[PDB]
Structure formats: C-alpha cells, structure tokens
Amino acid sequence: TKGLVLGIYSKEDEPQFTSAGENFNKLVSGKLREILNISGPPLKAGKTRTFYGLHEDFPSVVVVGLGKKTAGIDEQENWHEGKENIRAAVAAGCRQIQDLEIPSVEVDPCGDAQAAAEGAVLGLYEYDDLKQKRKVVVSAKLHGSEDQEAWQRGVLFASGQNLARRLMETPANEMTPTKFAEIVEENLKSASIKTDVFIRPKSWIEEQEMGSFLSVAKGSEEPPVFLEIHYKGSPNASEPPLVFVGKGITFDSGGISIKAAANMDLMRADMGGAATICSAIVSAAKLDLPINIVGLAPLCENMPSGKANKPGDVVRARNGKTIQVDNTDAEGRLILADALCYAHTFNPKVIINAATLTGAMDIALGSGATGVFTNSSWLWNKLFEASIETGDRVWRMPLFEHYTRQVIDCQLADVNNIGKYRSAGACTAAAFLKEFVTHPKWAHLDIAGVMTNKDEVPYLRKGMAGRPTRTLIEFLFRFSQ
C-alpha cells in the first residue's frame, strides 16, 4: 500500500535496529535482516537502502542509518547529536519513499518521536505551489501508537518552521506587506481564539510618529503595514508579555543605495525576521503555552523611485533620535528603530527581535549558527540551551560600546545607519539597535547567514530555511514551563 522508514544503528555483534524494525523483521520472518546482509556494507549515519516487497502492505521499506544508539549532547557541536542523527536520517528515508511516488509513509519513532517527525516534515517540504510540475504529496504518519504527543510536537515544531519557510520563500509580488499580515492572522487565529490581530496601516504608523519605518516605506508604491500579534496565554491576562519584533522588508533592492543584480532574488526573504518570529508565536498558541506573547513586525518594501529615501538623510525615530541614512540598504536597522520603541509600551519581560539584518553576519558564522547579541547572559543561556535541543544553533556576538561609538558619531544627527568603517559589520548594526532599546533583557538575532539552506542542514531541502523558528518556540515552551 504505502511505504515505511525503518532504522538501524551501528555495531555491537550485529548492528541493531530501532525496536519497530526488529519487530517488522520478526513479522516478515527474518527476511529484512537477511536481505540487509545480502545488500552490501552497513548503513552509517543518514545513509539509506530500499528493500522492495518485504511486506504485503509495505512494498517499499527504506532502512536509514541512525548512527550510535547512545549519541548524545556534543561539547563541540553544541547540540544533541542523536536528534540530529534521526532528523537527517528519517528526512533521507522520507525523500526516498517520495521519489518512489508513494503518497503515504509510516515512520519509525527512532527513539525520539519528535526528531523523527521534525525529520519527516522538514525533510519533505518544498513550496510546489507555483510549479505545475510538482513531486508526489506524501502523508507522513507515525508508525505505531505508543509515542503520540511527542511526534505531534515534532509535526508542530517543524510545521511552524515550514510556515516561516513558505512565508519567506514566496515571490515578494505575491507575499506583500498586506498578504503576509493576512496569512499570519489566519494562522494565528486557527491556532488560538485567545488572540487578537492588528494589521495597522500607514495612518496609524504616521500617528505613531514612526518616521524611521515610514522613510523606508516611501520609495515603493506598496503599502506599509505595522503588524501587531497578541497571544493571551497566561491565566491572569495582566501578566507582562514577551515581545517578539522582526524586520519585514517583502523585497529588498537596496533602494537608491541599490543592490547588484547577482542573486538579488533572495531579497524576497528579507522579511525572514518577521516570518521567523510570527511562525514561532503561531506555534506557542498551537502549543497553548501559559504566557502572553506580543508579535511586532514592520512590513514594507525597499525600492528606488522619484520619492525614495536618499543618501544623507535625517529622519526621526519614534523616540526623538535622528538617524543619518547614509546607505538606504541599511533599512532593517531603521524599520527596527521604531518597532523596538513600541515594544517598550507593552511593558515586556524579554524583547526578542529577529532580522535578516547584515551580510557580514553571513561572512562571520554563515549558516552554522544564528548570531544573537544580548545584554542578558540569562537570555543568552536561555537561547543557547534551546539550541542544543532543537539543533538550530545560535552563537553569541558582542554588544560592546566599542561599536556603539562608531555609529554614535554623526555629522548631521544622533545615530547613523552604518558605522565609520567596514569591520565588525554585524556588531555596529546591532549596536545601533541598542540605541533604540532600554529594556534589560533584550536580544537581537541576526538571521542573515541562516536565511538559506543547500546541503548544510540535511533534513532541509535547498531554499529558504526558516531558521531559527524551532529554537525560538523551544525557548517559549521552557519559559512557560
């Protein structure tokens, strides 16, 4: 009927199976173990082998490599390695059932039903929607009935990611400042009726003295929308919130300080900051987490025109500070100078903000870890531990005065959107945003190196990554618990 992803570890006396496959072997009377011997060398990590006709109702059975049974937290990779073995491994497996065009598949729990589900679901995702030429659409259910809410936690966590991924990936002519707001509101509302959405327009933004956000919007003839998300998780609604903030440029052409044509099509995912955090709130509502969260996202585009933002311009942020706009591509910093100010209105506990802010971050760590600068070691630890579980690493970076200094000197104004020099790129951009924040537990996450995947993360196919949505969701689960 349908396919099966089964698993095996690496040697003891005979390389063992995850019990479900030990059990499926008994079932086809040793003929799985036996054909695996006949096939060739053993299956190391995330390597795959397909065995036809072993079972009457499982014509294709893919056995995938899970590595060492007792693989655990790694001091060097700063993750739980087991989970990582299982994700790459059942992603691998699920992508094999899928090339065989088997529309459904049952997955071996592999000792961690959540890693299995985060592998099967992140593993299989594409964004097929505008290609009339699509791969088969395969339904992936758990094999078994024992470990069900952890597999659904995998499906949940990986699905919150695939949403950031679709929200990122879609061409920015479809994915506008209005359409993103609309899908996020429909997604947050299906998640919890204990929610409110506000797709606030230019009049409200104008009214909110958001000059910096608004200066950025004006080049395009596409409407700005400041989005406001509310999740009423706590028992007493009056609990102070945890506010997520995120930059939402639907398309970044650089503006007058215009980008080069080389691969500029990826700028459609410069709204990755707004996508990431939104998908993460949708998931804590889906999880129905005992915390009140607020989601904030400036949405607009960065375009050249007869009325675009010019180099040398002093605009005013909500908080009275003026910014010299010396480079029109440094606009996420400006979009975020106002949504960050508005975050203090809400009286929060933690203000996590996220943004595909600078390529220098990409030069720095470049898809290994997502750089997070925070004036809070508590907050750092909190993020870093979630990174170990989820596997979507996060690395700390310096919010030293050293850097505020280069952005704080300014010919016309109070702050300047770029620093005096080329060096320390992600650090000057983060020390510019510190100027718009006075809350003690603040964290900037620069998502610009983890924007994309190719081969680096296994269980993620080539394209927009939606990183770090699960670390973020894992942080709010641990914080709620």
On whether the CB atoms of residues 120 and 110 are closer than 8 A, the answer is no
Q: How far apart are alpha carbons 430 and 112 in whole angstroms?
A: 37
Pair of tokens at residue 472: 């973020």
Say how many residues make up the chain.
481
Closer residue to Zn ion (CB): 177 or 332 = 332
Closer residue to a copy of itself (CB): 172 or 473 = 172
220 is in an annotated binding site: no
Residue 422's CB: how many other CB atoms inside 10 A?
9
Residues at the contact surface with Zn ion, assessed by CB under 5 A: 249, 252, 270, 329, 332
Q: How far apart are alpha carbons 206 and 213 in whole angstroms?
A: 9
Minimum Å gap between C-beta 316 and a copy of itself is: 9
If binding is defined by CB under 8 A, does position 410 make contact with a copy of itself? yes
Binds a copy of itself by CB under 8 A, chosen from 12, 145, 235, 306: 306
Minimum Å gap between C-beta 299 and a copy of itself is: 15
168 is in an annotated binding site: yes
If binding is defined by CB under 8 A, does position 332 make contact with a copy of itself? no
Whether 321 is catalytic: no
326 is in an annotated binding site: no
3-state secondary structure of 182: helix
Partner interacting with residue 270 (select from Zn ion, a copy of itself, none; CB below 5-8 Å by kind): Zn ion
Minimum Å gap between C-beta 254 and a copy of itself is: 8
If binding is defined by CB under 8 A, does position 395 make contact with a copy of itself? yes
Total number of residues that touch a copy of itself (CB under 8 A): 105
Closer residue to a copy of itself (CB): 236 or 422 = 422
Minimum Å gap between C-beta 273 and Zn ion is: 9
Helices 401-408/425-433 angle, 10° precision: 80
Pair of tokens at residue 170: 């879609």
Looking at the chain, after which residues does the C atom sit over 2.5 Å from the next written N, breaking the chain?
none
- Percentages helix, strand, coil for the chain, rounded to the nearest 5? 40, 20, 40
Closer residue to a copy of itself (CB): 98 or 159 = 98
Partner interacting with residue 14 (select from Zn ion, a copy of itself, none; CB below 5-8 Å by kind): none
**106-145: which residues touch a copy of itself (CB under 8 A)?**
127, 130-133
Please tell me which residue in 333, 382, 434, 467 is annotated as part of the active site.
Answer: 333
Partner interacting with residue 332 (select from Zn ion, a copy of itself, none; CB below 5-8 Å by kind): Zn ion
Minimum Å gap between C-beta 90 and a copy of itself is: 19
Q: How far apart are alpha carbons 441 and 443 in whole angstroms?
A: 7
Cis peptide before 235 (omega within 30 of 0): no
Please tell me which residue in 259, 321, 396, 441 is annotated as part of the active site.
Answer: 259
If binding is defined by CB under 8 A, does position 219 make contact with a copy of itself? yes
257 is in an annotated binding site: yes
Whether 405 is catalytic: no
3-state secondary structure of 382: helix
Which strand (E) or helix (H) includes residue 24? helix 19-27
Q: What is the chain's Cα-based Rg? A: 24
13 is in an annotated binding site: no
Angle at 9 between CA 6 and CA 13, to 5 degrees: 125
**261-300: which residues touch a copy of itself (CB under 8 A)?**
261, 263-268
Shortest Cβ contact with Zn ion: which residue? Answer: 329
Closer residue to a copy of itself (CB): 355 or 369 = 369
Closer residue to a copy of itself (CB): 1 or 190 = 1
Residue with tokens 């952890």: 150
| Residue span 59-98 as binding mask against a copy of itself, x where in contact by CB under 8 A, dash where not | xx--------------xxxx--------------------
**155-214: which residues touch a copy of itself (CB under 8 A)?**
169-174
Binds a copy of itself by CB under 8 A, chosen from 163, 303, 334, 372: 303
Q: How far apart are alpha carbons 428 and 417 in whole angstroms?
A: 9
DSSP code of residue 437: -
Strands 415-416 vs 322-325: parallel, antiparallel or unpaired? parallel
Render 185-250 in DSSP notation, one character per residue.
HHHHHHH-SSEEEEEEEHHHHHHTT-HHHHHHHTTSSSPPEEEEEEE--SSSTTS--EEEEE-EEE
C-alpha dist (Å) from residue 420 to 358, 398, 408:
16, 17, 10
On whether the CB atoms of residues 215 and 313 are closer than 8 A, the answer is yes
Residues in the annotated binding site for substrate? 247, 252, 257, 259, 270, 329
Residues in the annotated binding site? 167-168, 170, 247, 252, 257, 259, 268, 270, 329, 331
Residues in the annotated binding site for Zn(2+)? 167-168, 170, 247, 252, 268, 270, 329, 331
Q: Which residues are catalytic?
A: 259, 333
